[PDB]
Design a protein around this ligand. Structure first.
Ligand code: LFN
Ligand code: LFN
Ligand code: LFN
Ligand code: LFN
Ligand code: LFN
Ligand code: LFN
Ligand code: LFN
Ligand code: LFN
Ligand code: LFN
Ligand code: LFN
Ligand code: LFN
Ligand code: LFN
Ligand code: CL
Ligand code: CL
Ligand code: CL
Ligand code: CL
Ligand code: MG
Ligand code: MG
Ligand code: MG
Ligand code: MG
Ligand code: MG
Ligand code: MG
Ligand code: MG
Ligand code: MG
Ligand code: MG
Ligand code: MG
Ligand code: MG
Ligand code: MG
Ligand code: MG
Ligand code: MG
Ligand code: MG
Ligand code: MG
Ligand code: MG
Ligand code: MG
Ligand code: MG
Ligand code: MG
Ligand code: MG
Ligand code: MG
Ligand code: MG
Ligand code: MG
Ligand code: NA
Ligand code: NA
Ligand code: NA
Ligand code: NA
Lengths: 64, 64, 64, 64, 64, 64, 64, 64, 64, 64, 64, 64
């Protein structure tokens, strides 16, 4: 059985690096992370000093 | 990093109050709740005494 | 077996009340109405004296 | 010919009132506003003192 | 309030049995599982000895 | 001209048998049923003794 | 309250004429037909002597 | 950079002519119109003397 | 077994004729073409002398 | 690099067996078939002696 | 109230830089730009000397 | 007439480079490649030594 968690990563550099930021967090706390699916991308402008790229991913991990 | 949980709130009064019911539950158990996105709305009729409005939300919270 | 009918309710008050208007009509004419799913919401402006909120629902009822 | 503008209204009270807030703004600046279609709903939590309901609408107006 | 978890079940037999595999896992660890919605179906071929059917479900459970 | 009706079939056995349950009902009451399109699948758990598979179909029939 | 019926019109000439074929049928049998929304378009080739254009519409009519 | 405006053209003749009606209006007021994407089609019936076909397009134009 | 190919037809006349242009090409090179599904429509303006209507279709053909 | 082909399998027995029918055909003619994604399901009724289940899949294969 | 404009940025380097190109243009002409949502990505090949990455964004700005 | 092929490119570096990997393969084997549309993005983790970014594109080419 796989389970997915819905995470938004952030980066001041790129959409790829924002995806990595989410996956990094998943790997910090979960075993057997197997893949990620991109489900949204965006850019935060008004709330930050530098533009911040965001990539939202479903991160899949194998249970048991 | 943000994470989202997928919650359906209920209310005998309105779709807005059903959204609040979900967000209230998230705030009971999670720190740093930052926003919610409505993803579905519905009305339960046959299983209840009074019509019950339901609003399903992805509730986003900031990790760490 | 359930069947659904696709109804747009209207209200001069709210999206919740517009959903109720559709469900009310379904219950006038159908037995065993069990739930409704919201599929669209809108506001009529140019054709009416007062803004009219509209909520379109699939209203499900149990056959037999 | 109709044209649409994509507006997000806000309210501390309800999704219906947030839709009205957008339509009000459109009517301040545009002639012949004829209808609105709801395209998204959400709730701002972390950036505000009170929860703020948001309703995004395509507001249609007749040209010429 | 209901909450959903996003699970992919697997089976060497059928899409129905793959859905059951996910629901079984949810019932092992959660109380008050109430329904599941199918959100994707697929077949793993290259990574397995026998074709493996997969059915991804949002499994809903009642909180509290 | 074709017309479609939106039916949810049920089965304690499989998603295929749930689709058949809907189509069977359509054929009981309608002439010239020509095809069905699957539009949703789900599993009822909390309201039933045995898990019940549900398959929602648009059932198309030829008018006249 | 509005209700919609889901009809596929056909024409050997065009997608516009296929939409008209559906609307014509609705007006034969229903009072107060008010609008139609196109939801799919296609072309039947193998089952017919001449290519047949098909346009599927939700035809809305006002109840009461 | 391209920008798009969301226009609904109308015609008493066809969906193609309704698309042209929108594009014509864009070309009246904008320089460097480069393409259009159809996003919806419909037919107005109750508000008009003759059926009126409508085609909604995102009309893209090059800035600068 | 059916297979589909994803073709964009073009016409200086209409969306229907653009669909035909794609289907014509499929029939030039494939046996047993059975139907087509419209998946997108658009208009090329900047790259052409005359507006060019485009209709993208999945063209289905029976294998073997 | 992976490539996908869009195939509709058929079966007089089940949606799972219809998916297998498509994958079987892909494996007859292609090397390195790695997975399939279900994209539609349906039932043919009017054109056949027995109901025929159909499952449409994108079948992915590795190039080179 | 927020308003969105629908812009396609371009870059010979990356999808991230194409998003920035759109946002840059918005900030040239608009006050209070607050965020952007990615809605499409593509690559122009035939019309250009070098491949050109394109990222289409809804750029949101606060009115008043 | 344009035709599209559905390709998933891969890269250990970025989503942009994964798109290029697919387009490169198309240009190896096809004449008159004209554009690509991004349709999905993902990251392979469990099956590889280094995270592998994947970008799925419809690559369009002009026939004849
Ligand atoms: C992708 C994205 C979407 C957003 N949407 C909203 C919104 O709907 N309302 C809001 O007050 N702020 C937003 N913000 C700040 C956003 C920010 C980003 C990066
Ligand atoms: C929005 C909504 C959707 C529902 N869908 C189903 C369903 O598919 N099958 C079912 O047995 N009960 C339902 N029920 C009870 C529902 C109830 C609600 C409120
Ligand atoms: C949600 C909504 C959508 C509508 N769409 C259209 C349309 O496409 N064309 C039209 O002539 N009138 C409309 N009207 C009047 C509308 C009215 C509402 C309330
Ligand atoms: C509906 C909604 C969506 C939002 N999405 C985002 C987002 O993607 N990223 C972000 O930094 N802030 C958001 N914010 C603050 C949002 C706020 C709202 C109300
Ligand atoms: C439904 C399904 C989808 C898949 N998608 C991918 C993919 O995008 N990339 C990949 O390397 N492997 C996959 N695999 C292995 C898949 C496997 C299945 C069963
Ligand atoms: C597919 C499916 C969806 C459902 N959705 C809901 C829902 O939204 N709310 C609810 O009270 N019950 C449901 N129920 C009971 C459901 C049941 C099924 C089988
Ligand atoms: C738009 C369209 C879609 C169709 N889809 C199918 C299908 O999925 N299976 C089938 O046996 N026949 C079809 N047929 C015959 C079709 C025919 C048309 C016109
Ligand atoms: C495509 C289309 C959609 C429409 N939708 C609505 C609606 O939702 N409510 C309404 O009062 N009128 C409409 N009208 C009048 C419409 C008219 C058209 C042509
Ligand atoms: C439907 C359609 C869509 C198009 N999209 C784009 C695009 O995204 N970028 C571009 O440079 N050119 C386009 N072009 C030229 C287009 C042309 C048409 C006809
Ligand atoms: C899933 C499915 C869809 C279909 N759609 C159509 C259609 O749109 N028009 C038609 O003449 N026949 C169809 N047919 C025969 C179909 C058959 C199937 C099995
Ligand atoms: C994303 C994208 C989509 C496009 N779509 C089309 C199209 O549909 N027709 C066309 O003539 N050119 C296009 N072009 C040139 C395109 C170009 C791009 C970059
Ligand atoms: C985007 C993506 C999606 C995937 N989906 C699946 C899946 O559904 N099942 C599976 O066994 N493996 C997958 N895999 C390995 C995937 C891999 C990727 C990169
Ligand atoms: Cl989710
Ligand atoms: Cl429907
Ligand atoms: Cl828009
Ligand atoms: Cl495809
Ligand atoms: Mg930096
Ligand atoms: Mg988002
Ligand atoms: Mg009360
Ligand atoms: Mg729901
Ligand atoms: Mg009042
Ligand atoms: Mg509507
Ligand atoms: Mg207050
Ligand atoms: Mg939004
Ligand atoms: Mg076995
Ligand atoms: Mg999947
Ligand atoms: Mg049994
Ligand atoms: Mg459902
Ligand atoms: Mg003729
Ligand atoms: Mg169809
Ligand atoms: Mg005339
Ligand atoms: Mg519309
Ligand atoms: Mg001419
Ligand atoms: Mg297109
Ligand atoms: Mg048999
Ligand atoms: Mg289909
Ligand atoms: Mg360079
Ligand atoms: Mg695009
Ligand atoms: Mg490297
Ligand atoms: Mg994918
Ligand atoms: Na989730
Ligand atoms: Na817009
Ligand atoms: Na219907
Ligand atoms: Na394809």
């Amino acid at each position: 059985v796989f389970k997915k968690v819905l995470l938004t990563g952030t980066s001041e550099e790129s959409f790829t690096a924002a995806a990595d930021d989410a996956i990094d967090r998943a790997e910090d706390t979960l075993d057997n992370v197997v893949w990620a699916e991109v489900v949204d991308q965006g850019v935060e402008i008004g709330a930050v000093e530098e533009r911040t790229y965001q990539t939202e991913v479903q991160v899949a991990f194998e249970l048991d």
